[PDB]
Design an enzyme around this catalytic site. Structure first.
Site, mmCIF file in Angstrom:
data_model
loop_
_atom_site.group_PDB
_atom_site.id
_atom_site.type_symbol
_atom_site.label_atom_id
_atom_site.label_comp_id
_atom_site.label_asym_id
_atom_site.label_seq_id
_atom_site.Cartn_x
_atom_site.Cartn_y
_atom_site.Cartn_z
ATOM 1 N N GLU A 322 -3.183 3.924 -5.087
ATOM 2 C CA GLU A 322 -1.996 3.096 -5.008
ATOM 3 C C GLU A 322 -0.743 3.920 -4.675
ATOM 4 O O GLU A 322 0.087 3.498 -3.874
ATOM 5 C CB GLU A 322 -1.788 2.291 -6.291
ATOM 6 C CG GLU A 322 -2.964 1.405 -6.699
ATOM 7 C CD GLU A 322 -3.562 0.575 -5.555
ATOM 8 O OE1 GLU A 322 -4.755 0.254 -5.632
ATOM 9 O OE2 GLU A 322 -2.844 0.211 -4.596
ATOM 10 N N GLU A 344 -5.688 0.789 4.395
ATOM 11 C CA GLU A 344 -6.619 0.834 3.270
ATOM 12 C C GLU A 344 -7.643 1.941 3.395
ATOM 13 O O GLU A 344 -7.986 2.578 2.417
ATOM 14 C CB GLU A 344 -7.266 -0.519 3.012
ATOM 15 C CG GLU A 344 -6.295 -1.586 2.522
ATOM 16 C CD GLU A 344 -5.608 -1.219 1.205
ATOM 17 O OE1 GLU A 344 -4.770 -1.980 0.720
ATOM 18 O OE2 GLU A 344 -5.954 -0.177 0.622
#
Ligand SMILES: *[C@@H]1O[C@H](CO)[C@@H](O[C@@H]2O[C@H](CO)[C@@H](O[C@@H]3O[C@H](CO)[C@@H](O)[C@H](O)[C@H]3NC(C)=O)[C@H](O)[C@H]2NC(C)=O)[C@H](O)[C@H]1NC(C)=O
Ligand SMILES: *[C@@H]1O[C@H](CO)[C@@H](O[C@@H]2O[C@H](CO)[C@@H](O[C@@H]3O[C@H](CO)[C@@H](O)[C@H](O)[C@H]3NC(C)=O)[C@H](O)[C@H]2NC(C)=O)[C@H](O)[C@H]1NC(C)=O
Ligand SMILES: *[C@@H]1O[C@H](CO)[C@@H](O[C@@H]2O[C@H](CO)[C@@H](O[C@@H]3O[C@H](CO)[C@@H](O)[C@H](O)[C@H]3NC(C)=O)[C@H](O)[C@H]2NC(C)=O)[C@H](O)[C@H]1NC(C)=O
Ligand SMILES: *[C@@H]1O[C@H](CO)[C@@H](O[C@@H]2O[C@H](CO)[C@@H](O)[C@H](O)[C@H]2NC(C)=O)[C@H](O)[C@H]1NC(C)=O
Ligand SMILES: *[C@@H]1O[C@H](CO)[C@@H](O[C@@H]2O[C@H](CO)[C@@H](O)[C@H](O)[C@H]2NC(C)=O)[C@H](O)[C@H]1NC(C)=O
Ligand SMILES: *[C@@H]1O[C@H](CO)[C@@H](O[C@@H]2O[C@H](CO)[C@@H](O)[C@H](O)[C@H]2NC(C)=O)[C@H](O)[C@H]1NC(C)=O
Ligand SMILES: *[C@@H]1O[C@H](CO)[C@@H](O[C@@H]2O[C@H](CO)[C@@H](O)[C@H](O)[C@H]2NC(C)=O)[C@H](O)[C@H]1NC(C)=O
Ligand SMILES: *[C@@H]1O[C@H](CO)[C@@H](O[C@@H]2O[C@H](CO)[C@@H](O)[C@H](O)[C@H]2NC(C)=O)[C@H](O)[C@H]1NC(C)=O
Ligand SMILES: *[C@@H]1O[C@H](CO)[C@@H](O[C@@H]2O[C@H](CO)[C@@H](O)[C@H](O)[C@H]2NC(C)=O)[C@H](O)[C@H]1NC(C)=O
Ligand code: NAG
Ligand code: NAG
Ligand code: ASP
Ligand code: ZN
Length: 902
Positions: A322, A344
């Protein structure tokens, strides 16, 4: 010509500059049971091209603005056209403002609205989350905009490239804390209309995307640290979680991870503060909101007293993941969702690097191989796979956008980016990465922009030389699906590539611009010595003496499996590798010790080597101390257990595995000082966990004895659990398996009173290990009682019982019989009929069991199958493939295990 409000993509005639948004959640239901929030917003935008219509996103918002749904003003001395009408267009999620004349290029406008929505418990937009503190049900308000839900909280130009600054204000109960992307401007002030409420304004965000906004109102508390450079770091959680110290690990690793990334990216952390918040039952897992990252509790919190080392590893890597985004994704944002894989994918790779910085003894970087590489190859070796890249013009609807978030995007994305960094070298990769981040800060990009900046770095040096441009190489890996098997004949050094499919009968129907040929970076080791690096060009076949071998020598390709491919050899070379691993395994890197096992079982599936060759590749394991190769074996063999554990094959299989794992069991027996102390580093702890799992599940009496002794010890002293959290799942399971209603009832009691989810999970799962039919049935009888078993845990518990060879028929009987309960629980919370079906039918491998599934299907005349409709067809198809695989393999495999089990 179509009307622009019926198109899914926004016009580019108007671009946002900045927003004010004030949100007010009402955390007390309106007595019909409805929770709402109210909002007011002003968006300032610039007209690029003249237009007489404003189209902006809005989803499930009611407007209470005076007059039309918006009020429209000119900025400064701009005139504004009158509004004709405002309308909501639900399908394309638009608020549409029709004007009586045209906006003017270069002019800015302010559009003000007042609105409300449901504060639903739906994990979308601004939403509510309910949880328990003692006797009281608590409710907090929080956000999840990813991907297209910012528009559900306030009207906005809700596409990621349309960045703006945001001035957020929250109006909230005066005894709750309010949090957003940015720090609060100052102290909260009372709401004049009702001083029971307070107003908290936040500092202006940087220029940023709507999907990354967050704001939360809760009773949460925090642990804090101020970094050297003044950056305030907080971990937020439930008061009771904080008081127990469960936030400490996350706080420990956050500063080092932020530090690693600022250096890694050659870019300062772009915000004044970092909040991370643990939310109960946040089903999305984590979300990288800029300055306020949300996590499910069990992803962020850590209890040293009850949590295993694998839990610790989950925390540090999800944090690293994150936080990676706080630059890559958030500071520089991909222009459109078709490039989600780069965002991602990149984070899924560098999470290992950031976490490695936090825990440098753990060798965490290795774990991308089992965790992402081989994981994703299982699905990328199918004809039904898809390329990383998707044309931007095929990705329009919110559903199409959501489909971007899959295994290919994350895990293959991670795999290919890792390959790219490796063949560039990391120093070079970092240079281009820095260049890209500096060039595009606060703006948007495509993957082509990254390639371009990497190419700049390549062109700016003389040491790394490539067979083509970065773009041309990565095109092979991004525009076509799948990956090659690279096959080497070491007698000649002939080397070939072909598109690898697990199903050797499969037809590929997806065409490739490259005819499924790749440009492949190939490292190799010969007799344990690194060789010159080699590139396979876009050809079927080539020859290099690098891959030519004498009769005593061996060669091995793809060191550390940095390359996204699998490798086969001629049989002689396989044998030489085998003899090496037999005699001095140390000569071959531990990751490649695992690779040999991973690849050969896939190759055996694809009929490219015999299954006995894959099995031979496990023979060295009796002297293997390290985690990965053992994990490779256990992952590859779990299907063999699934197919055979009710068959004559099983005895010899157990026996073979007992033989192999016994020395490792003995090793750890001594190393751990009679199991009193864990091994120091993560990999060895993992190896210990698996060795004890494997020993016990295969009936090594020493492990069976250890499990009974510890569980006896625990039962004589319930408040002092003597079983280390690393070992609990095995020790619990094996001990309940050996025991009767005494062990089972005791563990049941412990489950009912457990306060921690992960300890509850282990108990729930171990309870399924009983060998008594009556206990397993009684247990099944509990799974539908929400008093005894949480609904969200029912199908899981049923699956765990199905997992017990003895519980198989009982679970299958239970699911068939209580199938008439889709029409209680396709309305009363989802369930996942789908995952239930797959679990309970997973073993099926005979005509007779297929005849059974077919007979079960003839309850088509009503209830149907729900969200599990499609997975019932998959069960039928998987069973056919199981029937065919067992018929092909049973004889060969039985006699191998017999032959090798002493
Ligand atoms: C988006 O929100 C901003 C923050 O509220 C608005 O800017 C603020 O406007 C306030 C009033 O319009 C100003 O506060 C004070 O208002 C009195 C009115 O009596 C004025 O005299 C003063 O200018 C002002 N006091 C002080 C000490 O400045 C704020 O100045 C102002 N806050 C700022 C600029 O940080 C924006 O106007 C609003 N945007 C839109 C388009 O409405
Ligand atoms: C956004 O506006 C929507 C449309 O006006 C609202 O949706 C309506 O909610 C109404 C009231 O909550 C419902 O009407 C009735 O409610 C009364 C008592 O509240 C009951 O007697 C009735 O059972 C119920 N009516 C019916 C026909 O069953 C409406 O059902 C509903 N209308 C529509 C078209 O959805 C939203 O509530 C409002 N949302 C917010 C957050 O303000
Ligand atoms: C966040 O970091 C903290 C500082 O690095 C860690 O605090 C350390 O906790 C360790 C485990 O409890 C302690 O190690 C040993 O604790 C036992 C307690 O009975 C003692 O015998 C040992 O003397 C002690 N170890 C040493 C080397 O003395 C440490 O005392 C303690 N370290 C510091 C600097 O305070 C946290 O554990 C960590 N939090 C998490 C969840 O990982
Ligand atoms: C959000 O708040 C910021 C900070 O107060 C506002 O930025 C000001 O914008 C005005 C007019 O656009 C300028 O005169 C000031 O110079 C700005 N200040 C700073 C520090 O940049 C911004 O306008 C606000 N957004 C909205 C929509 O009102
Ligand atoms: C914030 O204030 C509210 C109201 O004073 C508190 O909410 C009440 O908490 C009690 C338990 O102490 C419950 O029995 C009530 O039902 C609650 N009321 C509502 C409307 O939920 C709340 O506990 C306070 N929170 C903090 C952190 O001080
Ligand atoms: C980004 O990287 C640059 C260039 O490598 C860093 O600048 C170097 O910093 C060292 C520190 O001792 C100096 O010795 C070099 O001479 C610097 N090189 C240049 C070209 O200036 C820079 O510190 C990094 N910046 C950030 C924000 O991380
Ligand atoms: C998306 O990103 C591009 C850059 O990749 C932005 O275009 C740049 O805008 C800056 C500031 O106006 C200019 O200095 C550059 O010349 C632009 N580069 C271009 C056009 O290639 C673009 O503004 C962003 N799109 C949106 C809607 O904000
Ligand atoms: C290795 O590759 C070479 C080709 O580069 C193969 O040798 C060729 O085989 C064909 C068979 O029809 C002959 O007609 C060519 O003249 C051969 N070229 C030579 C000998 O240079 C060889 O068979 C391959 N060996 C393998 C795959 O084991
Ligand atoms: C293959 O991966 C291993 C790790 O599994 C790498 O070994 C590390 O090497 C670095 C630098 O050489 C050391 O700082 C680490 O301590 C090493 N770890 C271990 C466990 O040996 C190895 O370098 C990789 N090999 C290649 C060719 O890339
Ligand atoms: C694919 O086409 C060929 C026909 O030549 C056939 O062997 C095969 O059955 C077809 N389908 C599958 C799933 O293999
Ligand atoms: C095995 O090889 C390792 C490293 O290649 C070497 O250091 C060690 O001496 C070897 N062990 C034996 C018993 O030869
Ligand atoms: N961007 C998020 C997705 C989500 O919040 O579901 C993640 O990859 O963790
Ligand atoms: Zn991510």
């Amino acid at each position: 010509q179509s009307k622009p409000w019926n198109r899914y993509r926004l016009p580019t005639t108007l671009l946002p500059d900045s927003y004010n948004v004030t949100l007010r959640p009402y955390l007390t239901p309106n007595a019909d049971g409805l929770y709402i929030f109210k909002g007011k917003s002003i968006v300032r935008f610039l007209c690029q091209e003249p237009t007489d219509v404003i189209i902006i996103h809005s989803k499930k918002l009611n407007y209470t603005t005076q007059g039309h749904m918006v009020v429209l003003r000119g900025v400064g001395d701009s005139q504004v056209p009158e509004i004709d009408r405002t309308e909501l267009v639900e399908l394309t999620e638009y608020l549409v403002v029709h004007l009586k004349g045209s906006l003017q290029p270069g002019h800015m406008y302010e559009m003000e609205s007042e609105f409300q929505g449901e504060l639903a418990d739906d994990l979308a937009g601004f939403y509510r989350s309910e949880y328990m503190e003692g006797n009281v049900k608590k409710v907090l308000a929080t956000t999840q905009m990813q991907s297209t839900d910012a528009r559900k909280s306030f009207p906005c130009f809700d596409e990621p490239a349309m960045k703006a600054t945001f001035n957020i204000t929250l109006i909230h109960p005066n005894n709750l804390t309010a949090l957003s992307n940015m720090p609060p401007k100052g102290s909260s002030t009372p709401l004049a209309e009702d001083p029971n409420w307070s107003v908290t304004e936040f500092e202006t965000t940087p220029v940023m995307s709507t999907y990354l906004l967050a704001y939360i109102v809760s009773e949460f508390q925090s642990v804090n640290e101020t970094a050297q450079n003044g950056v305030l770091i907080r971990i937020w959680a439930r008061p009771n979680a904080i008081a127990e110290g469960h936030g400490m690990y996350a706080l420990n690793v956050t500063g080092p991870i932020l530090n690693f990334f600022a250096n890694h990216y050659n870019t300062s952390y772009p915000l004044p503060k970092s909040d991370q918040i643990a939310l109960p039952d946040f089903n999305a897992g984590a979300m990288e909101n800029w300055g306020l990252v949300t996590y499910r509790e069990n992803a962020l919190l850590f209890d040293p007293q009850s949590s295993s080392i694998s839990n610790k590893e989950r925390v540090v890597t999800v944090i690293a993941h994150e936080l990676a985004h706080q630059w890559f994704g958030n500071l520089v944002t991909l222009a459109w969702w078709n490039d989600l894989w780069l965002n991602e994918g990149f984070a899924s790779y560098v999470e290992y690097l950031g976490a490695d910085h936090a825990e440098p003894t753990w060798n965490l970087k290795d774990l991308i191989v089992p965790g992402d590489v081989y994981r994703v190859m299982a699905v990328d070796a199918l004809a039904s796979s898809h390329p990383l890249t998707t044309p931007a013009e095929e990705v329009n609807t919110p559903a199409q956008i959501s489909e971007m978030f899959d295994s290919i995007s994350y895990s293959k994305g991670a795999s290919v980016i890792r390959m790219l960094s490796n063949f560039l070298t990391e120093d070079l990769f970092k240079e281009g990465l820095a260049s890209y981040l500096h060039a595009f800060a606060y703006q948007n990009t495509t993957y082509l922009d990254l390639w371009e900046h990497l190419q700049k770095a390549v062109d700016a040096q003389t040491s790394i030389r490539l067979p083509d441009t970065v773009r041309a190489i990565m095109d092979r890996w991004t525009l076509q699906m799948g990956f090659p098997v690279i096959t080497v004949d070491t007698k000649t050094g002939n080397i070939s590539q072909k598109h690898f499919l697990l199903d050797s009968e499969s037809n590929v129907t997806r065409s490739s611009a490259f005819d499924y040929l790749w440009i492949v970076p190939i490292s190799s080791i010969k007799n344990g010595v690194m060789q010159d690096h080699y590139w396979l060009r876009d050809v079927s076949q080539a020859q290099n003496d690098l891959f030519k071998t004498a009769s005593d020598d061996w060669v091995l390709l793809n060191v550390n499996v940095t390359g996204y491919f699998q490798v086969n050899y001629d049989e002689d070379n396989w044998r030489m590798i085998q003899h090496q691993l037999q005699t001095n395994l140390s000569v071959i890197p531990v990751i490649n010790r695992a690779q040999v096992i991973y690849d050969s079982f896939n190759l055996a599936t694809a009929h490219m080597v015999p299954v006995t060759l894959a099995l031979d590749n496990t023979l060295f394991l009796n002297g293997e101390k390290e985690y990965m190769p053992w994990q490779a074996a256990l992952s590859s063999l779990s299907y063999f257990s699934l197919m055979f554990d009710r068959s004559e094959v099983y005895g010899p299989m157990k026996k073979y595995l007992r033989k192999q794992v016994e020395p490792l069991f003995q090793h750890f027996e001594t190393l751990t000082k009679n199991w009193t102390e864990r091994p120091e580093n993560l990999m060895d702890q993992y190896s210990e966990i698996n060795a004890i799992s494997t020993a016990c599940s295969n009936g090594l009496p020493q492990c069976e004895n250890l499990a009974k002794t510890l569980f006896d010890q625990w039962m004589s002293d319930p408040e002092n659990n003597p079983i280390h959290p690393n070992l609990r799942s095995t020790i619990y399971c094996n001990a309940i398996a050996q025991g009767g209603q005494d062990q089972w009832d005791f563990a049941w009691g412990q489950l009912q009173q457990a306060q921690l989810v992960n300890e509850a999970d282990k108990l729930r799962s171990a309870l399924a290990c009983s060998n008594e039919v009556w206990l397993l049935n009684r247990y099944l009888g509990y799974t539908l009682n929400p008093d005894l078993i949480r609904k969200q845990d029912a199908t899981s518990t049923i699956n765990s019982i199905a997992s017990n060879v003895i519980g198989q028929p009982l679970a299958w009987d239970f699911v068939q019989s209580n199938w008439k309960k889709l029409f209680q629980d396709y309305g009363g919370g989802s369930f996942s009929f789908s995952n239930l079906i797959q679990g309970v039918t997973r073993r099926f491998s005979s005509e007779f069991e297929l005849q059974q599934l077919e007979q079960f299907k003839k309850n088509n005349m009503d209830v149907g199958f729900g969200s599990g409709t499609r997975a019932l067809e998959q069960a039928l198809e998987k069973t056919k493939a199981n029937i065919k695989w067992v018929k092909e393999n049973k004889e060969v495999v039985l006699n191998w295990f017999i032959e090798h089990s002493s």
